[PDB]
Design a binder for this molecule. Structure first.
Ligand SMILES: CCC[C@@H]1NC[C@@H](O)[C@H](O)[C@H]1C(=O)O
Ligand SMILES: CCC[C@@H]1NC[C@@H](O)[C@H](O)[C@H]1C(=O)O
Lengths: 620, 620
């Protein structure tokens, strides 16, 4: 269950397999398996970590449907692998992968945004090893994220009543028809690495939780006492593990030796006096060092963590007992050449931009992000809402067992991967699923999503709040959204409806706000905004002008400022990003307050000014 | 019936009233009557001619609903008006106007794109006169062009199932909701002028027709004989009119004195040996000089005309017996400050650009244009399809008697105004009305449009072909379009349907072409294209890129080149233009092959190259 990021120390080594690989496109629903037995014939180069779609302009890989095959060779010293447990880890293969080492099928995986790994101890041999990875990009009614089995993509245009169109449609080249509004970037989007652990016994998982805070200071910089819990899982086979708590300076401030009881596991509590707390805008990180004892040390892992509590109370969102207000946006892992490929230069820059904007939070729309981004936000005091790739769901999916299991897999996998991050304060179990309507549809939606709500609570040892990001819908027939711990709504009053009319937009918004006021839950925006082409200007800003985006946020935010129970503003989007092509997508989605090259539109400056005057704690 | 453009000569003088007028906005359905009786209080400046909407950035006149009031003073010498018939002419007031002179109501007009005039002989007085013109911009279910009485604008976005939206809509500020895709620019869009004729008897109308051509030369530059007919109508009250035919150099090549028979009228035929013909790309113009005789002259008018025949024969479009092929586009009267205001600098430039592109034609989508543009195309050899403002029509309109009468008025007015232009070769009686479907709808559409088809043929002394520009629809249930003289179709395969897929788009296109092949009518594009933001580029062009627009025209035109019965390609659009704001309109409509500033996109260069190799005659 545990998926700790590979670590190098005295008992463990990591050997990265990133770089320029060999690559071939394959079939719509098959690939030659014998490609795993020998070097790929006439291979293309493909850098990895990264989407393959924008890495070859001779081909149109954005149009590709089905399989591609990655391959590379590697060799490591035999003396290093000797006596060790050898693990091959893929941080992300989008969406599904078959993995071969030296002609042996290691196995397969479907989750496109969460890591998976194989024990290759027996599959490895000395000298060059041949690693072949088939990657499947196909989406459909049974995938998460959801694809359409026929018809059009989102916000796709059609003239279905024209006989010639209907006929041509049946012979059209097969394409992925996304059930979501971002491009279906595929491939080895994140790192690949071989790593080592001891074979006989090893640390397999670590969970650190903040259990209680005693006498929190007025500024929440400290608590007189913090009670934290540890849970270390072991693999392999009166054994003991030593746990040391290291502060920001490397000083051991607490330590305990715990017994390993048998799934071998050691668990307990540690009291830390005058603990320095993790807050938005003021991060502080400890390290929990776990050492498996035989004075010598058998295995070790260093787990970063932060000491803080999260509690929804009435209409407030309390971090360390302080009423927090979200300032931020939905993001995407999206950039010009990498596509969905992870880029830590871009992560560092983006985090700096979040600081520049005086934002304090974002959501991982619409899939778990690269792990490094969470580490970065841990050390930079930026709060995260962590979201699974459950986007594009409707009633067709709720009756599908394979979908349900993949959804459960995504939730359990995300939380297993990300549980230790202090920056994460809430889980999102879906984005914009069908929840409303008449007949039994709302009840079917509820019956589908509640056990997933409960699962997220059961899987998270910190028991953070759980939400579901709700599309603009009939809130009166939706019976699911109101039952989340925090109500997270996507609303586009004045854009997709009442278009360009901000007075009417604010009126409508206020009507729905009056509804939510009676619901009595804490409520936040997780999306709202307007497509905006930088350089389009007007003295009276119309849709697509910079002025209109600015005016839009000014009016809307002026309205939500009147509601004490409205605890956050996350807009759409942080930055322009790539989508499936269509008549409403001007070189992708342009609701970014920044361009795709991270340059500030007028709205970004305005929002920066507003957010500079809004405190993380006590705004409402 | 006659609306000859005001002319200055020995018997007539024209006094233009253009310039900077006084201006005030008024109410949604009224204006202060005392504004006609005295100078406007606190007036704004407003240039005439021009739309008022973009002439004041302090106000948001684009959002204006209802009335505005223009006003100015003028004085003319008493000796000039003495004994003369004084006529006040408005080339265009969009859409409806009330006109007052010196506190007296002169009268009213509906129809925003055709001229009207008043006899002000008795209302005029010496010294300063006060001219007040109230202009109404409102469109609705009974206007041409058609507005929507509720809901959203044309190609607008909605979330009607959201209760807050439905409620907010009921209280939204009133706006014109166009059922058409161009901005509702209003005001005194064209010139205003006072002019003079003799009072006792005067020339009221002239019609020149090319009756027959005998032995047209091989190069169509001349005919051995041309039989032309004249029809001169008189107002006022053994009288005679002399008609002299002047060639391109002012030489009298023919002349006759005809009797005026009483509704005073003179009518007859004139034979011209070795007549020089008007052709696309090779214009030649004569002048018919009509002089009312009492050596002295009572009245005179100089009517330009061109000698040429137009005949649809089977699937061919014959100009002077030669099989013509349309190369061009729909245009708009649209520019950055003038809006729909006439601008002859821009007309001259645009005509030069039509030459640069090696185009030979355009359609006056979607309203009759300023008269000067037709004169310009007369002298520049550019062919025109003349179209009434019957755009946005559906079955709601066909049952409306007022709409039917306004439609007949538009047809009769357009043809009465424009009959003498040799450049005009075809009438369009509507753009994209509802024609298809099931039940009685196709029959209802047919029964509405056939008498308008017949009216257009009866009103035109030249009896030019008549068409109806058809939207992308179910061509199998449409029973109206196929009965037109030329089949003019608007098709957006690959843009509004089968989006981005040019293979499927061409396949669908070919299916419908297979349908039209058997109809046995000549068929042409009057619209097709793709919104294109200049500067957006891709190696594999996606929707909104320059490359995609280029590719679009390349593939589609490659398909229509295979059809001998396909006699023309008019794309959409000549240049980017302003629309009502909405989620598919990136600062208006961007399907222009030129920018709004008349700069060429990649597609323009490609089309220029293609059209350079396609002859006006004999391509098919
Ligand atoms: C469904 C309407 C809003 C929609 N919400 C989810 C995002 O993934 C999209 O980008 C956003 C948009 O259309 O901008
Ligand atoms: C809805 C069919 C297309 C439409 N046809 C009429 C033109 O007035 C519009 O500009 C054009 C467009 O959307 O580009």
């Amino acid at each position: 269950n545990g998926m700790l990021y590979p670590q190098s120390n005295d008992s463990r080594i990591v050997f990265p397999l990133d770089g320029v690989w060999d690559f071939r496109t394959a079939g719509e629903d098959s690939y030659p398996a014998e490609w795993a037995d020998a070097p790929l014939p006439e291979p293309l180069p493909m850098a990895v970590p990264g989407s393959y779609n924008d890495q070859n302009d001779e081909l149109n890989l954005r149009a590709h449907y089905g399989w591609v095959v990655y391959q590379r060779s590697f060799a490591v010293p035999s003396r290093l692998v000797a006596g060790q447990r050898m693990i091959l880890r893929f941080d992300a293969a989008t969406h599904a992968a078959d993995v071969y080492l030296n002609g042996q099928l290691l196995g397969s995986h479907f989750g496109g945004f969460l890591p998976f790994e194989f024990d290759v101890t027996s599959a490895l041999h000395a000298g060059e090893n041949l690693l072949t990875v088939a990657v499947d990009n196909r989406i459909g009614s049974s995938t998460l994220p959801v694809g359409n089995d026929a018809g059009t993509a989102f916000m796709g245009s059609d003239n279905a009543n024209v006989p010639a169109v209907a006929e041509a449609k049946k012979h059209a080249r097969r394409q992925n028809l996304p059930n979501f509004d971002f491009f279906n970037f595929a491939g080895l989007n994140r790192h690949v690495e071989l790593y080592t652990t001891p074979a006989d016994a090893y640390i397999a998982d670590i969970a650190i939780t903040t259990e209680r805070l005693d006498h929190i200071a007025g500024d929440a910089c400290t608590a007189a006492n913090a009670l934290i819990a540890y849970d270390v899982t072991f693999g392999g086979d009166g054994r003991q593990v030593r746990i040391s708590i290291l502060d920001g300076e490397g000083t051991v401030v607490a330590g305990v030796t715990a017994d390993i009881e048998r799934t071998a596991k050691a668990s307990g509590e540690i009291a830390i006096r005058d603990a320095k707390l993790w807050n938005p805008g003021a991060a502080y990180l400890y390290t929990a060092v776990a050492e498996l004892l035989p004075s010598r040390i058998i295995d070790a892992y260093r787990q970063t963590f932060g000491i803080r509590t999260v509690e929804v109370s009435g209409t407030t969102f309390l971090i360390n007992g302080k009423p927090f207000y979200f300032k931020g946006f939905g993001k995407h892992e999206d950039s010009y050449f990498h596509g969905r490929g992870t880029d830590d230069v871009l992560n560092v820059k983006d985090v700096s931009l979040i600081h520049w904007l005086h934002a304090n939070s974002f959501r991982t729309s619409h899939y778990p992000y690269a792990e490094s981004m969470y580490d970065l936000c841990d050390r930079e005091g930026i709060v995260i809402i962590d979201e699974v790739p459950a986007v594009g769901m409707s009633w067709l999916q709720y009756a599908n067992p394979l979908v349900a299991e993949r959804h459960r897999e995504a939730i359990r996998g995300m939380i297993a991967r990300d549980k230790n991050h202090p920056c994460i304060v809430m889980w999102s179990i879906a984005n914009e699923p069908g929840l409303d309507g008449d007949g039994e549809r709302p009840r079917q939606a509820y019956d589908y999503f509640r056990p997933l709500y409960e699962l997220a609570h059961a899987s998270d040892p910190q028991n953070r709040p759980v939400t579901l990001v709700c599309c603009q819908n009939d809130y009166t027939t939706d019976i699911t959204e109101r039952t989340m711990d925090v109500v997270c709504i996507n609303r586009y009053y004045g854009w997709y409806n009442l278009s360009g009319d901000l007075d009417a937009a604010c009126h409508a918004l206020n009507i729905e706000l009056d509804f939510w006021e009676n619901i009595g839950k804490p409520v936040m925006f997780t999306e709202y905004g307007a497509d905006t082409i930088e350089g389009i200007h007007g003295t009276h800003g119309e849709m697509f002008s910079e002025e209109f985006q600015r005016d839009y946020y000014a009016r809307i935010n002026a309205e939500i400022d009147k509601r004490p129970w409205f605890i956050g503003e996350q807009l759409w989007n942080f930055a322009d990003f790539a989508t499936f092509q269509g008549i409403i997508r001007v070189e992708g989605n342009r609701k970014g307050i920044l361009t795709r090259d991270r340059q500030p539109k007028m709205a970004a400056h305005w929002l920066r000014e507003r957010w500079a005057g809004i405190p993380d704690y006590g705004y409402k």
